[PDB]
Amino acid sequence: NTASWFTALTQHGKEDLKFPRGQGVPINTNSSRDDQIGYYRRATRRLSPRWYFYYLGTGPEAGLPYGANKDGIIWVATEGALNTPKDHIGTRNPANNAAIVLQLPQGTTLPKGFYAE
Ligand SMILES: [Zn+2]
């Protein structure tokens, strides 16, 4: 029920989403180095699946610890991130804020059949 802060990654292909370690946390300048960790969750349909990012300890799978195994949940973190729930970041209120356009830093390797839109 809680909304992601970011727009989705579209799964235009076959394989499930996955990133190298250290990669895949959306850019968000209203979040600190401590805050750069969480999960993408594949959504159940409204066609190509969409994956949405949530900060660790927020959202549909807030109760999961990092790296926990669940179908349609994959984990990402940046070096420096604290392994704690991001209660102060939370999830987005669509009444107050539009989705942030999901952007990843230069070089980042999106898997085959994924694009930011
Ligand atoms: Zn913070």
Author numbering: 48 to 93, 104 to 174
Task: Copy text from the publication.
One central protein involved in the formation of regulatory ribonucleoprotein complexes (RNP) is the coronaviral structural protein nucleocapsid (N). N plays a major role in RNA genome replication, translation, and packaging and has further been found to interfere with host-integrated stress responses and stress granule formation. The latter, together with the extraordinarily long basic β-hairpin finger, constitutes the positively charged primary RNA-binding surface.
Interestingly, in contrast to the other nat_mutants, NMR-derived CSD plots for both mutants revealed more significant changes in comparison to the WT, suggesting a more far-reaching modulation of their fold or plasticity toward complex formation with RNA. We were able to solve the 1.7 Å and 1.9 Å crystal structures for D63G and P80R, respectively. Surprisingly, both mutant structures superimposed with WT similarly well as the other nat_mutants, with RMSD values of 0.668 Å (D63G) and 0.898 Å (P80R), respectively. The effects are moderate and may be neglectable in the full-viral context, which is in line with earlier findings using P80R (and A119S) variants of N testing the infectiousness of virus-like SARS-CoV-2 particles, where no significant effect was observed. On the protein level, mutations D63G and P80R also impact the gene product of the overlapping shifted open reading frame ORF9b47,48, where they result in T60A and Q77E, respectively.
